[PDB]
Ligand binder design. Sequence first.
Ligand code: HEO
Ligand SMILES: CCCCCCCCCCCCCCCCCC(=O)OC[C@H](COP(=O)(O)OCCN)OC(=O)CCCCCCCCCCCCCCCCC
Ligand SMILES: CCCCCCCCCCCCCCCCCC(=O)OC[C@H](COP(=O)(O)OCCN)OC(=O)CCCCCCCCCCCCCCCCC
Ligand SMILES: CCCCCCCCCCCCCCCCCC(=O)OC[C@H](COP(=O)(O)OCCN)OC(=O)CCCCCCCCCCCCCCCCC
Ligand SMILES: CCCCCCCCCCCCCCCCCC(=O)OC[C@H](COP(=O)(O)OCCN)OC(=O)CCCCCCCCCCCCCCCCC
Ligand code: HEM
Ligand SMILES: [Cu+2]
Lengths: 184, 97, 659, 259
Amino acid sequence: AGGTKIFGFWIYLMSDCILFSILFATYAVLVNGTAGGPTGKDIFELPFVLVETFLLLFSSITYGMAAIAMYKNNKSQVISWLALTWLFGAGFIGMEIYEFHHLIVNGMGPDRSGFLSAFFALVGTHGLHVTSGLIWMAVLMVQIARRGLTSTNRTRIMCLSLFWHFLDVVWICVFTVVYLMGAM
Amino acid sequence: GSVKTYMTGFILSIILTVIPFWMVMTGAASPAVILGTILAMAVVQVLVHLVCFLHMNTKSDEGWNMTAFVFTVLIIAILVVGSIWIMWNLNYNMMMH
Amino acid sequence: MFGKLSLDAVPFHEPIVMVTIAGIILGGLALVGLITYFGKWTYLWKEWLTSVDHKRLGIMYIIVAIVMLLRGFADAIMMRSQQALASAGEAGFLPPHHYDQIFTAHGVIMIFFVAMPFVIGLMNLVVPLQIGARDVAFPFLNNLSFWFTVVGVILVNVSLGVGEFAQTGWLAYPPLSGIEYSPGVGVDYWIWSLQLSGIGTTLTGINFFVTILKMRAPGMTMFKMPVFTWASLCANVLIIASFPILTVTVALLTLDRYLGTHFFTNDMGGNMMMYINLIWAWGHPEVYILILPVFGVFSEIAATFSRKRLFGYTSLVWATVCITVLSFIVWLHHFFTMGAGANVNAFFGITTMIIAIPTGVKIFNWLFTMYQGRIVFHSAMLWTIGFIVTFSVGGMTGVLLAVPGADFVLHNSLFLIAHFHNVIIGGVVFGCFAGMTYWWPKAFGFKLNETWGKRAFWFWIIGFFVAFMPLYALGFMGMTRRLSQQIDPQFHTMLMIAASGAVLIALGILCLVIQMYVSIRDRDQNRDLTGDPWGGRTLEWATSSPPPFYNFAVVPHVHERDAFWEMKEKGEAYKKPDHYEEIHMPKNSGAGIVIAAFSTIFGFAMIWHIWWLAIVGFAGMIITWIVKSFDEDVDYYVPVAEIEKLENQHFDEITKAGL
Amino acid sequence: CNSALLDPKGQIGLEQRSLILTAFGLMLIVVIPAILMAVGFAWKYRASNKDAKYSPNWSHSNKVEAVVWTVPILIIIFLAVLTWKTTHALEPSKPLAHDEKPITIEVVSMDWKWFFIYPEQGIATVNEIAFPANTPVYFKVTSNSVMNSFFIPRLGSQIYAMAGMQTRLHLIANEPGTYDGISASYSGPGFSGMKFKAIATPDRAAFDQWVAKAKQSPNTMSDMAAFEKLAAPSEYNQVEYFSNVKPDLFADVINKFMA
Ligand code: HEO
Ligand SMILES: CCCCCCCCCCCCCCCCCC(=O)OC[C@H](COP(=O)(O)OCCN)OC(=O)CCCCCCCCCCCCCCCCC
Ligand SMILES: CCCCCCCCCCCCCCCCCC(=O)OC[C@H](COP(=O)(O)OCCN)OC(=O)CCCCCCCCCCCCCCCCC
Ligand SMILES: CCCCCCCCCCCCCCCCCC(=O)OC[C@H](COP(=O)(O)OCCN)OC(=O)CCCCCCCCCCCCCCCCC
Ligand SMILES: CCCCCCCCCCCCCCCCCC(=O)OC[C@H](COP(=O)(O)OCCN)OC(=O)CCCCCCCCCCCCCCCCC
Ligand code: HEM
Ligand SMILES: [Cu+2]
């Protein structure tokens, strides 16, 4: 019942991990495809990515404490630990929006230099998943505030636990292949 | 308790992110020692996040939930290495020789 | 109203389109008028459209596939008519603007909306019955997956009347499908039909993977499963691992045309060879998604109508697991002529012929299943014998194409065209009609007409051979695919035979319609009363015909392969339980239709650049998803009064008919 | 039997006819007995045949399942050794060993015609090539537009034509004649008329009188302004000759996508 949905969501993340690997394969082909424009070393600010990496890492341990609080019967502390990992994920999204707004205004959008197309399609598709999990987190927070730690709400916490920790696993592959390999 | 697995897997992923970042931001006199350790610490930190955060187990769905992950790693490795190998030969050809 | 919709988008002054526009508008209004005449709107809702029953959803998949089979055949009969007129020097009907939409739409409809729903609808009806399950693992997700496929067939059909379809071929290769060589809405129709229907089949593969692994009967291990369940398990693995490749590849084409990005462009660092690498990394696992459950269909039919156990179960199982891994390492054989090295071409040429080894083990294991049986020549057994002859010819042809040096003269020929119509018509279409004939009494309670089912076979067999063995000869003569105008006169008299063979295939489709009419007209005389019209071996035939909507009052205990056959030989399986308990069943939901109704609004607005409507359409899919999460009445319990009523009416049919 | 692939006129076509024939004959040792068993077992083991042995519980034999795995394995083993050897011998962009100093012809696919450049002769043609028989021909193939496929079916292999990219093809003609070439990859509305003639001359004197004929034209190709005038979208083009060409025009077509 509950464990069938949790196993079934794990199979979806394995298809979602295949989805990200096509974006990684497209980036590796197109990384040297700069059309006389900027390369990775001219664009990537590595102090900025280190703050973005630690915000997604802080939201992973904050969801882990929310699941720990779900394995006691403290409904209030599941909410409080879910309130913080929403803030760290909104900080992560707000920095990626600031990163993309700096490129688009300064003429380095996706419509220029198809290295920049593969950059925007990998970092942007990751941030669309973080935005999708941020909406799911706020819908879950108002369900637990209204109904409590019911059996259906407990399964939805463990389904989003799989989703949220997977986005931090993908980001380890993102900042290594894109940012750290690009700024060598 | 189970805080200890979350806390160790958080301390470890702090170390496994600072060291690859400090090498590029400093320079470390070797692009090949940098590239090896960056991909090594990326793989190790992915393994830390599966064990500590996702709680990957060999006995979780009677063997499944683990073989499903091992299968897709092989599919990802076939798709990524295969497409890179194909596109490298397609781009070494189609050149003005 | 807004966007690029202009009322000059409707193809006026084009009679071959406007006649088929009025044939669907008046055809749809006549169909709408019958439902309100007989008062069946409250019955189609609450029993069929909102149904989370896998038996109801499996039937509706096949109804969509049969209806789309008529449209995908009616334009293939126009290509045979045009190619027979273009040779012998006539610029007849179908100008190249008109003709190039037709092979693109024929490829899209017949793959995605004919072959895919027929294979999925056979797995929907049968697989929960074979494993002793009462429903699929995620029943609301199964209903939502059907309606995403309906959104795909709506968007392709409105491109006939509102805009035009793509003119790029069925896989929409780059720059020809780019925004500077295809500036119109045709590729946008192709993009959003495949995107919205493609997320529906991804949820189908997840649903049947968890159903086979978790929802099995007690005692049924993996190597006691039916072979059709094994084939459905491996086919759904390929759906989970390859339909994400299609989702990214079409979305990267979407960003190229809408946002002006450079992925597969010619100029600004884009690589158009990356798409052809990516679209065939999905492309070959798709053709093994189609042929794997057909292999499972033919294994159950050959065991049933030989009255003999299936030969080499373990070899047949491990040949299926061999194919589902080997399907991901062969995809470069579709672009041997692109210009990769000899090492890359010979590697993927060698491993393409490795996948022919487990297919030959499957073929010969069916041959020894009927090596010492008592073969009853049913209609479904006729499709099985005809598959082995036809698929062996077409499979042998593809291994010839798997040699790269041989493929350098046969790439994109009519030899290639005749190859994959030999393994889809020969394999998938024959397997879909065989499983339709086999599982018709289980789905509906009465048997199909045996006389008209055999006549439909004899027109689909060598009527296919008149249609496509000339294209083998034309592929040697040098005729390439997608040829429309001023075809060489030496290709005439061989395009004339191929056109005559399509008329025989048309008579087999007509014989299928007569077979469906006569069976419904005479259903009270050909009723299936015991639930086992043949001598069936798997657990589906332990139920009544049609099954009691929970499939099983008590879930059966399995001890061996062919669980219903071993029960019959021990005198069991017509055993009345002394008591019953209530069955926890899911409820029907109006969402999933509402989620798909906003998705076809979202898809239509993205095609025509109506951005306020696409925001409203996309927000509708998300708010309906959110408001479905707050619903708490998702389940109910079937009372023991309803179970005992439905089982005592099955256990006197057993008594009044002998057993 | 006389059908442009079973009757080829080039060495690459003749080596591919033997490759098609030996592959087809190899697969027939397992496909003919499969079809014969599909009909023979259906007839001998009918339900109405009361003389045949009936074994309903026989589902496993080690010797039967050994042969069912071995003989498909052994055929593919012979077919993979053949596939490896012939892919490294019939590969395009592998020059043919003739010591005849091959003629290089540069091929540009347009909408919807074939543009041919003869860079060592200073000649360009549309929808017609000529070359001597028994001399190798080095084809450098590119696109100005969407992807095409350069195919002369009676002479040998095909290769894709892609914009900004340079594929290579080597062919030879063992007999004089004229061979119809086509585009083998669909490229738009005018794709059905992308047909050219490929004349293999009896000797080099007839090739020298075709090059001298093709430089009596008043039309030139001396700039990229004249190229983009000719690269305008057109259908079912006649054979056209250009007497003067730009000395490195083929690289300029590639460089308008790679720069
Ligand atoms: C569901 C349909 C389907 C099936 C079953 C197959 C099965 C095969 N496909 Fe056909 N493919 C299919 C659908 C397509 N393939 C295509 C294109 C295609 C091409 C590209 C050629 C080109 O682009 O120029 C090659 C090389 C093949 C090879 C094969 C091989 C070797 C098999 C093998 O799996 C067949 C194995 C079966 C055999 C061999 C017979 C059974 C064995 C017997 C009887 C005894 C054993 C014999 C031996 C071991 C030799 N496929 C295209 C082209 C799309 C397009 O271009 O637009 C489509 C749709
Ligand atoms: C191009 C952009 C497209 C974006 C489309 C999708 C994103 C929009 C926002 C979606 C997020 C809102 C989710 C709804 C919140 C409520 C969900 C919930 O509580 O359900 C939990 C559910 C467990 O199931 P159950 O408990 O039965 O609940 C049934 C729900 N009806 O658990 C579930 O299984 C349901 C929740 C799963 C959510 C999956 C996350 C979607 C990720 C989308 C990726 C977007 C980008 C893709 C890239 C395109 C290709 C390159
Ligand atoms: C809106 C604009 C766009 C339009 C696009 C089109 C939308 C897609 C619609 C597809 C949905 C599929 C519809 C499926 C309806 C199936 C109804 C059916 O089969 O009912 C038969 C019913 C069976 O009777 P019963 O005795 O209960 O038999 C037990 C079987 N388990 O027998 C009965 O006694 C009931 C008799 C009434 C049934 C009449 C309904 C006719 C079938 C509906 C239309 C199907 C054909 C066209 C589908 C187009 C698909 C693209
Ligand atoms: C998928 C490939 C492409 C990826 C990008 C776009 C899609 C993102 C969304 C994918 C979500 C997948 C979730 C799968 C979970 C499966 C296991 C599971 O937990 O299922 C739970 C539940 C099924 O529960 P069930 O028992 O059927 O009944 C529920 C009653 N409330 O399941 C549910 O009810 C939740 C799932 C149903 C709702 C999904 C429908 C919305 C999808 C809209 C996509 C919008 C895309 C638009 C943009 C274009 C794309 C580029
Ligand atoms: C494993 C195999 C899976 C097969 C999947 C399904 C594919 C074919 C779909 C058709 C089969 C469904 C019909 C049989 C169901 C039972 C019908 C039934 O019970 O009869 C009711 C009704 C007339 O009976 P009535 O007088 O109301 O009362 C008697 C009830 N016993 O009888 C009727 O008249 C009902 C009419 C229902 C048919 C409408 C469905 C449309 C789908 C047709 C597809 C296209 C056919 C080609 C064009 C046909 C039109 C010329
Ligand atoms: C039943 C009789 C059928 C006939 C007579 C027929 C006829 C044709 C013809 C004439 C072509 C184009 C050949 C060319 O380009 O020269 C074609 C292409 C194609 N057919 Fe069929 N077809 C039939 C069934 C099917 C089925 C059942 C499928 C299922 C998958 C299918 C899939 C395709 C595809 C994918 C293409 C290539 C699309 C393209 O060229 O872009 N066909 N068919
Ligand atoms: Cu393939």
